[PDB]
């Protein structure tokens, strides 16, 4: 019956595990880019290399914006679902 | 040299992050669809059910599960913001370093 609730609680477990894995990759990403800033600081054309660093950082900036937008989209939908639920029961 | 090999490595890492995320975005879709069907099944239950105690027990169970997803999503959002803003700090610093 309404024991999709046991099942879906288990889906959250799986997705939470998948999340820490992705968070790990976010720390490692942040790790390399800090190492790389330090390299550039030491070496301060090389401004073609600078141009490429800026363009790569731009990519990461755009990707994390997409990550945010996506979390907010699903979070918003969860809210709507809780609102629907509330009106259902009240 | 050390500078070049990091630039390739970090680019491979971004591509690996793009793929991992698409998988996570897929999972968020799934969760959203699963919870939609959870809601539909609840509606079916509420319809048939005539026992107020069992209804109230199930309402509680539903609220608590939704709260867990709510809390976890707020946690995904906080982590992305933390790392996004760290990057933006680095980007600003770097801009001023090279100009
Ligand atoms: K009823």
Taking the C-alpha atoms of residue B72 and residue B70, their distance in angstroms, rounded to an integer, is: 6
B28 touches chain A (CB under 8 A): yes
Reported resolution, Å: 2.2
Distance from residue B44's CA to the centre of ligand 1 (Å)? 9
Technique that determined the structure = X-ray
Q: Domains of chain B, with CATH numbers?
A: 1-99 (1.20.1480.30)
Answer yes or no: do B70 and A52 touch at CB < 8 A. no
Handedness of CA A80, B67, A67, B80 (dihedral sign): positive
Taking the C-alpha atoms of residue B25 and residue B41, their distance in angstroms, rounded to an integer, is: 24
Taking the C-alpha atoms of residue A54 and residue A48, their distance in angstroms, rounded to an integer, is: 10
Helix (H) or strand (E) holding B61: helix B52-98
Question: Cα–Cα distances in Å, from A85 out to A19, A90, B10, B21, B97?
Answer: 27, 9, 44, 29, 52
> In the structure encoding, which two tokens stand for residue B51, read together?
């026992």
CA dihedral B86, B88, B94, B95 (to 10 degrees): -160
């Amino acid at each position: 019956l309404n024991k999709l609730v046991e099942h879906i609680k288990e889906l959250l477990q799986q997705l939470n595990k998948n999340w820490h894995r992705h968070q790990g990759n976010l720390h490692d990403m942040n790790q390399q880019m800090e190492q790389l800033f330090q390299e550039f600081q030491h070496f301060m054309k090389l401004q073609n290399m600078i141009h490429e660093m800026q363009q790569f950082m731009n990519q990461v900036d755009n990707h994390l914006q997409s990550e945010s937008d996506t979390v907010h989209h699903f979070h918003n939908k969860l809210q709507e679902l809780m609102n629907n639920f509330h009106h259902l029961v009240h």
